[PDB]
Amino acid sequence: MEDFVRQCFNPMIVELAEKAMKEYGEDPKIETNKFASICTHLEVCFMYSDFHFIDERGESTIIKHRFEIIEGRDRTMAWTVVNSICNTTGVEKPKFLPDLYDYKENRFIEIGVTRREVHIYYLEKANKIKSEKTHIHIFSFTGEEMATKADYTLDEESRARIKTRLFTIRQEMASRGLWDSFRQSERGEETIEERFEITGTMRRLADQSLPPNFSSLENFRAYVDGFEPNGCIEGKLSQMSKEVNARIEPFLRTTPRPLRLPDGPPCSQRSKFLLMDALKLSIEDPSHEGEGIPLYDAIKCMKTFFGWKEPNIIKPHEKGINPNYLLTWKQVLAELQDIKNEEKIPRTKNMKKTSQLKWALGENMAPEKVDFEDCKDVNDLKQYDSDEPEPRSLACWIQSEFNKACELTDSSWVELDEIGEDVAPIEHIASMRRNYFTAEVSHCRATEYIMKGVYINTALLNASCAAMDDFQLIPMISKCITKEGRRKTNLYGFIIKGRSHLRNDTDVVNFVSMEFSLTDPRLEPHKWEKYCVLEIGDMLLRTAVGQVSRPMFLYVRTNGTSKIKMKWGMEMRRCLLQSLQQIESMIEAESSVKEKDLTKEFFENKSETWPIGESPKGVEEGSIGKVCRTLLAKSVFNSLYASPQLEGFSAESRKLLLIVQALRDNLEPGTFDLEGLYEAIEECLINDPWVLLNASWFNSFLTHALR
């Protein structure tokens, strides 16, 4: 506002208004509305006075000055001027201070600029000041005006100029967000400051919001206003017991201890689909009729396998009814045969509701929702079971999963879109880095997992959206490019989706997944506690003795998913980005130390190896491609096994890693509650196989780094 006042009026009026405010001890910085009011009044008075002269005969000509200003001067000097004028012209003494003197009309003219309506202002002035023989002119910012007896001393041109000036000032204040305050600061003929009082309920609430030894907010304000620092902190510190301290305990090579992993039965697999036990039936070069539509591709993939036999239960699901799973598989086979022999198959196939499918999808198993009062006397009624989760011990199968996810596959799984040609040298460096990383990770098993998750989650989401209340059959499919460059379509199994009345993002749609496999569950039953595994056929494999027929099993389980989970699965390609970033980050960090680009040293050296694993002999080193694939697998497993325990462990063990690093840098690390940090880390280790594997990894790293 003050900036607007200074930039809007000419410096002469600004100085006049500043002097006027100084005369009354008013600071323009704090009283901005009063400053603007004074400036506007002075501007209007000067515009009224200016451009008005008196000819030699007595008439007024527009070019003796017709007007004498009385407002823009000191009160004593203004009184002197008014007294001289009255004595010379024999006019009556004005009771209050006038604004100017009109010589032609021989009177005292008072000009008032009103933020409110003109007539109210005029009535107030008449009831307050006018009294006798005083002309009053009232202007408004809206173009209105008023005068005594509708008599306007000035010509229409000057009045129009004043009206235009006030109108434009109003418009600029409105555009600058200042007109509201300016208009709300006028009461009568004065200009008050902002008012905001605490009274009534608010005053009592404030009086109840103080330190213990104060009764009213005014007393607390008085205490704070006169407060001066007199050794308060020093005295309080001298009064506080020495038991309140932050004693640094040294962190040496012998202080850290291994994390205590939980005990109990070994953990089990909880992924949505098989990872290293997955078996796929593949069709190369998909050139069949109706290509690109999952149902027909699944049909063709099924046709390529001969060896189907009578299914039977080999690994029962201790919690479920196995015959339901067996009948679901039989029904899937029967419906596939039916569509095959029908010779006219549509884009989607919705399973017919059946007892086996109703049970396997948990249909009607949801307890009915009733008011608590109507069922508060039930003896069995209890708070929803949220007991402490049962701890599980680390099992060796998760390490094998990661090892298999870190290795190369005989075919490519990701095909990225092209970008523009590189021109800048930094663009060439970026392209080299990205191309090396992509060449190292394009054939990784983790890329296959990424594509599997993306495809399966996309299909599940689309089926849920379209077939709202139908038992849709969704084949689990992925696409690949072999070394020869021929496209291949792989089928891992099928998913039957139940009712999908998904209103919110966190409500569950239940599905049943059947997945082909070549691994016998009986070797690791604890890994498959949530599965019912059937032996569905026999597969011929070529070995040194010819064609060996090994059993082919079907891992069947009921699972559930939400919209958020499906979206999370569909975004798995981001994992690749993450891994690349990590690799890039390392290079950049190293480059900063070496003051040169190290992309070639990282990738083209082919003699630098990083410690990336452990064996009975000791720490094992791997090439850059191995590091890239390992980081990609870690990202993919973080995405697949995302849980609160994982992020808790990551956050808490980052501190311990940094402390160990500071120890390795000879920076004399020290802690305050190291045991507390260990407790925080170990509270996240209950049952998740991925988090337990990460904890075991940290223990091994500690063993090797302390040495």
Partner: protein, 297 residues
Amino acid sequence: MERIKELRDLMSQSRTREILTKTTVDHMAIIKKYTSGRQEKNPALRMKWMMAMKYPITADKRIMEMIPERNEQRQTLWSKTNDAGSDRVMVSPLAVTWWNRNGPTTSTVHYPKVYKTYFEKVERLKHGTFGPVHFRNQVKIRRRVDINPGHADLSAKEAQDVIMEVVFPNEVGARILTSESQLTITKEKKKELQDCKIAPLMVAYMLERELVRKTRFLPVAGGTSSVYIEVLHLTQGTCWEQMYTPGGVLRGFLILGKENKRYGPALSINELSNLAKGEKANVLIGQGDVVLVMKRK
């Protein structure tokens, strides 16, 4: 007509009539921020699902005139349906592609004029030269940097005045109308965009990008001129620096007062040119202020 009838319908209701009669134009923008409902969650999934529909795009009835119902392959480009708000027809992206490959061509001469800043960026990048990349520890320093240089002479509010004069001539306020002289840039842009069919809102946005100075508080480690801030993503990083050099009539009115019915119906701003030197007239200015004004003599 449609708009006046909608106004009458709104004024029929007590609450909307209360709003319309109470809220002044000054506060209109404020009540423009009182939105209802909520915002779409996962708009990307929504767009993906919509793109699978046959007719997910909304056009106007005029599309029936030139775009055929079906193409050579008998695929239906548009259908007959409305959006429940107006006569907006439902069309496919196939319609967009069909227009792009077979639609009526025109002369796109105003596009280089309207989007001057974008083509200037294209020229600056096209003729630029690159040097080596230097790796080192980066010492960034924070300063205010001009994202848009704007016109050197024009200010921010003066640039807004130019934009209002060019794009919305009959909505200029009292400050423009009562001014004494017009700016050369205003006449230049007026002549340049005389017959331009691009949306006036887009033209106003482009003129704002071209004439208004915009500044941002950014950390830099090199050139801090407008041409260098746009390629910041390309010239600096966490630990590297890339050497690059870029390749490059209606005035003089006095407000006499509020509307005076004895001087006739209110006029538009554009038709103030037919007033005599001194004649008084009622005119609508700004965003709905009827004022009795006259020319200076």
